[PDB]
Symmetry: D3
Subunit: 167 residues, 6 copies
């Protein structure tokens, strides 16, 4: 039983970790696709796919989740939404269920015949990429929104200095 979760992870936050843990209770393995893998250095998409791979890797490992239970696969975006589900299938192992709170992702997989689950949102008011990046820019408390390992990655790659300069 393999599930699929897709997200920009800009950056990977506590909401992401929580949903992943719950998902791992109903599936044997979880395919985690880092979408928009081609975007980086913008206010909405500051981190490269590689930096995000490290964020995910450290965070999951830090939380004791065995690496054998998940796949981290960067996925560049494409121009045709009608071909995106096929695009994901082509780059990933086979999967039985799709977990997503993103309307577009839900509708695309739904139309393709996949069962789509929308997990309950975990503190959607604070655990969102938008809030995290807003706090980084306005000097708010973004650190509490992310697993400690992610904060370390961001510090190491000078993530805040980057996003502030770009803004």
């Amino acid at each position: 039983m393999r599930g699929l979760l897709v997200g920009k992870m800009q950056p990977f936050h506590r909401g992401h970790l929580q949903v992943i843990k719950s998902i791992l209770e109903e599936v044997d393995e979880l395919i985690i696709c880092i979408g928009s893998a081609q975007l980086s250095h913008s206010i909405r998409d500051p981190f490269t796919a590689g930096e995000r791979v490290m964020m995910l890797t450290k965070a999951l490992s830090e939380n004791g989740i065995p690496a054998s239970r998940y796949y981290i696969i960067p996925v560049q975006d494409i121009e045709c939404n009608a071909l995106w589900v096929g695009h994901i299938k082509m780059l990933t192992p086979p999967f039985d269920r799709v977990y997503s709170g993103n309307p577009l992702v839900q509708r695309l997989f739904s139309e393709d015949g996949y069962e789509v689950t929308a997990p309950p949102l975990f503190y959607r008011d604070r655990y969102s990429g938008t809030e995290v990046r807003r706090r980084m820019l306005d000097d708010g408390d973004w650190r509490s929104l992310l697993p400690e390992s992610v904060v370390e990655v961001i510090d190491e790659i000078n993530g805040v200095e980057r996003i502030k300069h770009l803004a």
Copy 2:
């Protein structure tokens, strides 16, 4: 200490496994990029990136190599060789050394300032994607050239029927 290995893995064979094991003796983790992730269903590139991810995953796991010791990242090809090293960096975790027997890959990383190691070839006369695919097409003994787990993947996805039809 993290190394980087790039290959089409069309399909993943015993030569690949051997070089990976030796590399894992000098580095802590190995980033394994599956190149030409956009190509599939052709005589030279029959398998999708996703099918190759499964081949690698099963094979490495079958050989007792812990998943925490490697990263499997599909990498689509790009038009400009001059930007390829940057392309790889953008999609991967940081790495210290590059292992490759491919002249182009060696020269590109070399010009970029990376130390490149060309591991000794393991039975280059039989352990090559070209030979494997040739045997699949001419009904030769391709199975002995691949780890058992890879053969199982190919059987499951009807790899031989596909490549034969395409030829």
Copy 3:
């Protein structure tokens, strides 16, 4: 005498039908290019090119316009506006006049040396893709804005459920 009409047809409405009929009174055949053929599943561009081909086909046929009097050709968008006129020429039969109310389309063809006609707008306050899609989303009366055959196509492909989910 062949004319050219380009439009997103998202979806094909009564305004489109009316302008086509009038155009067919001054030209022998009309080339109808469905622009942005690569876009689908978005609030501004909900339908695939194929679904739009059916909308046009059924509507024109429903209105007794012989198929021998027009060409339905999907045209993907391209990055360079400076090459778009050439892009259209490359995918279509030769044409003598261009009919369009779109400023960009008018200027591009004009600069290329083509005579461009801007037909009078037919109820521009209700007959527009924007209004149709707005009514579909807010449960307004979108059906009256489209030929009956188009409504049937939309019902069949669950167009409203799609656009509502995406919103």
Copy 4:
């Protein structure tokens, strides 16, 4: 009942016409996709998609086949074969059966769950794009291989002068 036929039509020849007529005896409408719509001015792909649209249109009309019985849709090629079937679906009306003698096309649609029919070849030794273009270049008898209407199109667009210059 709608069928699908895909071909480069470089140029449209008597073999194409014959297979289309037979297909039209088992389906109500035939979707005819002109593949490699982006290629032109090369020895293997001399004609633009638009020129080919005219070739098909004139030929089918010349042979009394009603325009309401077919769709002529140019389809640009894409880099990922794994997404091509989806690419075709996205640009076309729905279809029940696929007719093709091309191994790749057959395997792709087959893997996607479509029934694929390989019509008998009509004089494959003379009725092929390769032979036609070879005769045009070596001053052989290419005219007898094409419907008269197609020859007229080629004469009008100076097709032979083009291909000879390119060679």
Copy 5:
């Protein structure tokens, strides 16, 4: 000693000329990249790369700056910001310093290890592409913001008629 300046030059204005002159006092040659070379015919990017090449050429020549002191190189934009610095390097001669007031350009080159200088802004309230284009559209005094040679180019290519039609 060679410097690098990148800009859309939509259109080339007095601010551009001033910064170039000052830069030419600290470097032997200046590489001038016209960014977004693929965009044209839009309100934000009205002129083609070729038209901009003429604007730069005439203006610099008009101001007595020898052609041997600079390189005018059109550079199309790319999807990955992470590869852009590499993209520029690939299309240009080697350079020692980068001059730019654009935050993104500064951060990208900075992260790549280049020294980046942000020249003082020359009348930023009037000397900006945005103001120039705004005046062209609202019939303001755009001519005083540009070198005379640039105005002549714009008049010759009917730049104002174009941008007004597009708006």
Copy 6:
């Protein structure tokens, strides 16, 4: 009076220099487009566009040709030959005549309505990119085929070591 010359310049050789000098006797300025600006690090296309810009610049300057008499513009290739002439126009200043010995280039510009001149070939048996690169690889005398300034550029960028490694 402005002419246009397009070439890969892989690398710029004595034949190129000779044709340019003769052309400069009938035109006031010469636009020199370095085609395939996106290709580098391959046996057929070893040098980046930037390296070629330097080769041209040094060679022309070395031969006393004033920089004000020419434009060096890198041009990436595109997928549609039917749009290439438009692609060139978009990136360059206006031109009156096209000089080329390349059949494709000649036919494309010819069909677009341009007068195309095919200058006499200068020692075509030795002055060709193919011969130069062949000698570099087989240790033949490639230096005599290129202007001295070009040899210096190649030495400086380790061009021979690169092409030999790639082979």
